[PDB]
């Protein structure tokens, strides 16, 4: 499909932009990537142990905030040059089966 999200992934505050990347409510363990122009900005992986302890792996630095249904990335210091296509690349690890989905949008205009 086009890769278009059925919502607007962009919430506007004064400084920068909040990119909302949603995932199904049943998903327990996943990896969420933010992509600008096919290039990775942020990499977020949520896993859980046998004692229900949650580990949040985020190697590239990026201000992220998690909910039980969504993941918000926060971008700052935005000029006109950063107007581009942005994508949520979701990899589901738990529950099965393994599934990769992509939603997306255009930021400015």
């Amino acid at each position, epitope marked *: 499909i086009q890769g278009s999200a059925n919502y607007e992934m962009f919430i506007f505050h004064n400084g920068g932009v909040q990119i909302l990347c949603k995932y199904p409510d049943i998903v327990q363990q996943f990896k969420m990537q933010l992509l600008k122009g096919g290039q990775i900005l942020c990499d977020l992986t949520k896993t859980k142990g046998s004692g229900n302890t949650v580990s949040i*792996k985020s190697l590239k630095f990026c201000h992220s905030q998690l909910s039980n249904n969504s993941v918000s990335f926060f971008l700052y210091n935005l000029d006109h040059s950063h107007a581009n296509y942005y994508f949520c690349n979701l990899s589901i690890f*738990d*529950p099965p089966p393994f599934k990769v989905t992509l939603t997306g949008g255009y930021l400015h205009i």
Partner: antibody
Amino acid sequence: VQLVESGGGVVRPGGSLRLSCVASGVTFDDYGMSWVRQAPGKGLEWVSGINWNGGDTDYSDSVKGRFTISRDNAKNSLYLQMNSLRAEDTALYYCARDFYGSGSYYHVPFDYWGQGILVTVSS
Amino acid sequence: EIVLTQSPGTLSLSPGERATLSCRASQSVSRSYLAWYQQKRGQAPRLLIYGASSRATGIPDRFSGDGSGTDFTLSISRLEPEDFAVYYCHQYDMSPFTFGPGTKVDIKR
């Protein structure tokens, strides 16, 4: 990709052994690892599991006080330290990783590497 | 712990025939965390099925399966000569993760 597995052999009860699985051409931080053993002529027994950074581990009760799973991602190495060895620890030890590279050892499918490391504990 | 038994102990079939292997649990196991592995002589186990019904990457479509709660099934649509091996079911729902005793498929004569 090439996997080097070592550390096993013949040991007396009470001795020690450090098993090691080293992988060359893969990103180590993506996979949670685990150790599963097979006694001679028997089935499979899950021994231990560890997540991507080693901050989360789990053990079966049969080895909980004696074995230590660990990893060194910079060296792409997975270690099983084995102390207080018993004759019933004699087995072939396989190292395994979660199939889809989640970094978790829990509630994810696992697949096995190499041929196994033979450990024989005898007096 | 959750004890897994397998039926039958030994399966005696001819090449090209279809095979049905059964796994039963001592208590209800989540459908999402049951796997079937194949082991040939001298080889390490090989992940065939995960999530009761999802087929691992690179596994031929002749392997399928399903099940729920207490009972699960691995179906092999036609027996290739490499398939006369041992098959384990594996639960990773509740720690410790346990395996069945295994089912061997041997040549019938």
